[PDB]
Each structure stands twice: as structure tokens, then as C-alpha cells.
Amino acid sequence: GSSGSSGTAEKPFRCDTCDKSFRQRSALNSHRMIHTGEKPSGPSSG
């Protein structure tokens, strides 16, 4: 598994793709878009 997680992101927003976090909703809602393009190992919206 090689899992490495703990607690939660001090911030309310978090990217369930690269394990990121933002302070402003407009900052994350946009960052998630960058992931909605390439063909990474893990398809979504299906």
C-alpha cells in the first residue's frame, strides 16, 4: 500500500488528486482544473 496520510489539511480546501490544499475556494476550484486535462493514472467523472 505504501500509504502516507495523517490528520487533515489545516485548510478547508484540499485537492483529492495531488494531495494539495488552498485557502481560497477560487484557488482550489481552479487548481483542480489543471488535473482535468492530462491523462494521469486515475480516471474520474465516470
> Which residue ranges make up the site for Zn ion (CB under 5 A)?
15, 17-18, 20
Q: Which is nearer to Zn ion, 3 or 33 (CB)?
A: 33
> Given the complex with Zn ion, which of 13 and 20 has the nearer CB atom?
20
Backbone angles phi and psi of 30, in degrees to 5: -90, -40
Residue of minimal Cβ distance to Zn ion: 15
Smallest gap from residue 34 Cβ to Zn ion (A): 7
